[PDB]
Design a protein around this ligand. Structure first.
Ligand SMILES: NC(=O)c1ccc[n+]([C@@H]2O[C@H](COP(=O)([O-])OP(=O)(O)OC[C@H]3O[C@@H](n4cnc5c(N)ncnc54)[C@H](OP(=O)(O)O)[C@@H]3O)[C@@H](O)[C@H]2O)c1
Ligand SMILES: [Ca+2]
Length: 156
């Protein structure tokens, strides 16, 4: 199966020109928990923003610039490069999420209570086509700049 994992500010914002204006170590821990040793697919810009022991698949139209990871030129090649595995984790960014959302069966979302002026958004998903199977709210605290909610949705 294919899953997407993403951190969304209000209005589904996921990315900006520069680093995001927040500090959310709990979201990093959650991202690690749900990726671990599974294959990851990402776009070239996310890659520029590796883990041995797992397949790291980078989408780019151009030849790769780092032999430590696996470079592919199409969505079909990316899926093929992950092999037969229980779960493929698509970790960004916006262009890559848009292409894999119709193929995905699971979304792992972090809803962040922050308003940020961004240039990249998570794709529109119809909540009626998705079943929320897990949700967990957390307050901002000494380590996390904003409140945040972890949610897992499975496709209906
Ligand atoms: N392309 C542009 O016009 C351009 C220029 C400057 C800045 N930016 C900015 O970069 C920021 C990050 O965007 P993002 O989060 O969407 O990036 P992302 O998904 O992390 O990476 C997108 C990159 O992944 C590669 N890619 C995605 N789908 C592909 C496919 N089907 N086949 C082959 N390669 C594929 C392309 O790399 P390659 O580019 O290496 O082919 C593409 O540029 C955005 O803010 C955007 O405005 C875009
Ligand atoms: Ca960015």
């Amino acid at each position: 199966m294919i899953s997407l994992i993403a951190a969304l500010a209000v209005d589904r914002v996921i990315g900006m020109e520069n680093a995001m204006p927040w500090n959310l170590p709990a979201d990093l821990a959650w991202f690690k928990r749900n990726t671990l040793n599974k294959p990851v697919i990402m776009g070239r810009h996310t890659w520029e923003s590796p883990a041995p022991g797992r397949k790291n698949i980078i989408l780019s139209s151009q030849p790769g610039t780092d032999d430590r990871v696996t470079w592919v030129k199409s969505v079909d090649e990316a899926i093929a490069a992950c092999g037969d595995v229980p779960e493929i984790m698509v970790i960004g960014g916006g262009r890559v999420y848009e292409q894999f959302l119709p193929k995905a069966q699971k979304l792992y979302l972090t809803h962040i209570d922050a308003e940020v002026e961004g240039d990249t958004h998570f794709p529109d998903y119809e909540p009626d086509d998705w079943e929320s199977v897990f949700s967990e709210f957390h307050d901002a605290d000494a380590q996390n700049s904003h409140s945040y909610c972890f949610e897992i949705l499975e496709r209906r």
